[PDB]
Every structure is written in C-alpha cells, then in structure tokens.
Amino acid sequence: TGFSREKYRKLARGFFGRNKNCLRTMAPRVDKALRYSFRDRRARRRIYRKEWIQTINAAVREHNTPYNRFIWALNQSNIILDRKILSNLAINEPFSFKAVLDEVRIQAQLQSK
C-alpha cells in the first residue's frame, strides 16, 4: 500500500495494544490521526482568537469599558494593533496596555464610567 509499513509504525508508536503492530487496525487509525490533524490545524487559528478576546474582555473591564466598545474605537482610531499583542500586553506589559487604551477612548471621543 501507499505508506510503507516501516512508516506506519512511526506514526503509531505510542498507540494502545494492537493499534501499533498489526495492520488492519493501525492503518485506519493512523488515517484518522491525519484527518483530525488537518482539521485541528485550521481550528487552531480559531481558538487563540477566542483566547485573545477573553483576556482582553476581562483586563479591559477593570478600566470600566467592555470589549465591544474598545475595539469599535480601535478601528476608528489610527492604530493598527492586533488582538494578539493586546493580550500579551495586559498580562506581561500591563502599563502600556492602559496607555493604548487611553488614546483609543480619546480618538473616538469615548468616555468610560
């Protein structure tokens, strides 16, 4: 068959039982590993954007704005910054986060409360 048998046994080293040695189980259980991975990679770029929001949506409510009206100004504003960094900032570099948060409020004439 297509993938050699020296090659199946690499993709199925740490499998359970007869799903590592024998062929009538290993081949379809390696194939699903690769159908899943092709899927889990395009899903990988989804989950982080769910995380990047979820860290921003809680670091920004300490400053008494919610997520939606924050980025609403961010696109109005001149600034290009991503949701990636704004996550990394609020954790690791928090002072600069409040800086960025201020002009965004101001260039949009937004007023927290």
Given the complex with RNA, which of 39 and 63 has the nearer CB atom? 39
**Binding residue for RNA, selected from 3, 7, 10, 28, defined by CB under 7 A:** 28
> Do residues 64 and 112 lie in contact, with contact meaning Cβ atoms separated by under 8 Å?
yes
Residue 23 interacts with RNA (CB under 7 A): yes or no: yes
**Binding residue for RNA, selected from 7, 10, 18, 61, defined by CB under 7 A:** 18
Q: Quick count: other Cβ atoms within 10 Å of Cβ 67? A: 16
Residue 38 interacts with RNA (CB under 7 A): yes or no: no
The answer for 17, left when phi > 0, alpha when psi is -120 to 50, beta otherwise, is: left
Question: Cα(39)–Cα(74) distance, rounded to whole angstroms?
Answer: 32
**Binding residue for RNA, selected from 2, 14, 17, 80, defined by CB under 7 A:** 14
Nearest to residue 70, comparing CAs of 27, 28, 26, 106?
Answer: 106
Binding site for RNA (CB under 7 A): 5, 13-14, 18, 21-25, 28-29, 32, 36, 39-40, 43, 47
